Design a protein around this ligand. Structure first.
Ligand code: SAM
Ligand code: SF4
Ligand code: SF4
Ligand code: CL
Ligand code: CL
Ligand code: CL
Ligand code: CL
Length: 300
């Protein structure tokens, strides 16, 4: 999907910037493991500098400001403008669980190009407030997407697999690595996915340094080539051996207590093997997590 053109790596999807690693929700199987993270809000100046370096060799269709809950950031509009100023993307998208959206000001609605709201059963957003948000979106020329989630899929385990065939299959079918292109910027490094950077240091055994799976963003004389090779590499990451990619077992969406939130079951027992077969045939196969989706795009 990713191509090299006019001196830059072109991602048809988005570059992901996590405004906040923490969240106000405790969803089971959170892909960013946000329930395990204390407050950590990205610095707009640092993000601007890092993305400015990356943007000389990289362009994406959109920048996705997300994380745990980006509306927890003390100055999300400043972050939005820091990202926009680099020109690394065509548009800027914010993804939120919506629980704090009633506090967003006119500044927020004027700052974003697109808004993605996840609506979860335990924090249901009333349909009249969704309608309020759709009206606000149309008024400010913001493309709106509202996903009503019924299920989540398992994402990781502390007890990883030593079976290379299974890790190969999980990597090959991973939507984050190959279809969604969830390129993630964190602390000056670029990653193929949020799992490879956010899950290793949250293993209670201590894990490992996630930078082994990353690429340092720098003014290297060959940075374009290094970037292209990193983003088109076809070998499983170290983190793959503790991850379920896109084929983890389905479960009803629910929040868990913080105590005991981490997953210890052996990774092989958490694979949805029929779905792994299906995704081996078609990596775009719907994961069955979104029950329904509302889209109100801006067009013309
Ligand atoms: C880290 S979240 C974006 C941030 C924001 N706090 C939110 O979710 O509303 C990334 C997206 O992937 C979805 N997601 C996270 N974990 C998932 C899982 N284990 N299975 C399926 N979808 C998941 C979430 O619904 C979310 O829309
Ligand atoms: S909302 Fe649920 S999924 Fe999205 S970040 Fe917070 S916890 Fe993880
Ligand atoms: S770690 Fe390996 S499997 Fe898990 S998401 Fe990143 S690439 Fe896909
Ligand atoms: Cl996700
Ligand atoms: Cl392990
Ligand atoms: Cl390298
Ligand atoms: Cl467990």
């Amino acid at each position: 999907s990713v191509r090299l053109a006019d001196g830059k790596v072109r991602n048809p999807e988005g570059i992901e910037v996590n405004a906040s690693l923490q969240c106000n929700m405790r969803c089971q199987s959170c892909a960013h493991l946000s329930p395990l993270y204390r407050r950590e809000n990205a610095d707009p100046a640092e993000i601007h500098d890092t993305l400015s370096v990356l943007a000389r060799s990289y362009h994406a269709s959109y920048a996705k400001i997300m994380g745990g809950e980006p509306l927890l950031h003390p100055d999300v509009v400043g972050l939005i403008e820091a990202v926009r100023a680099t020109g690394i993307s065509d548009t800027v998208l914010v993804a939120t669980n919506g629980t704090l959206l009633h506090r967003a000001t006119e500044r927020f609605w004027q700052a974003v190009d697109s808004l993605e709201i996840s609506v979860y059963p335990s924090r249901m957003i009333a349909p009249e407030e969704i309608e309020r948000y759709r009206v606000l979106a149309r008024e400010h020329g913001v493309s709106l997407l509202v996903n009503y989630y019924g299920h989540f899929r398992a994402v990781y385990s502390e007890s990883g697999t030593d079976a290379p065939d299974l890790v190969r299959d999980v990597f090959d079918t991973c939507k984050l690595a190959h279809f969604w292109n969830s390129h993630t910027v964190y602390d000056g490094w670029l990653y193929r996915c949020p799992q490879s950077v956010f899950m290793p240091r949250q293993l209670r055994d201590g894990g490992w340094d996630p930078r082994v799976d990353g690429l340092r963003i720098e003014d290297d004389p060959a940075f374009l080539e290094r970037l292209h090779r990193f983003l088109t590499a076809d070998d499983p990451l170290r983190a793959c051996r503790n991850c379920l990619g896109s084929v983890g077992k389905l479960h009803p969406h629910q929040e868990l207590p913080r105590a005991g939130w981490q997953v210890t079951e052996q990774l092989a027992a958490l694979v949805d093997y029929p779905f792994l077969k299906v995704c081996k045939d078609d990596i775009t196969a719907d994961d069955g997590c979104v029950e329904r989706s509302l889209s109100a795009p801006v067009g013309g």
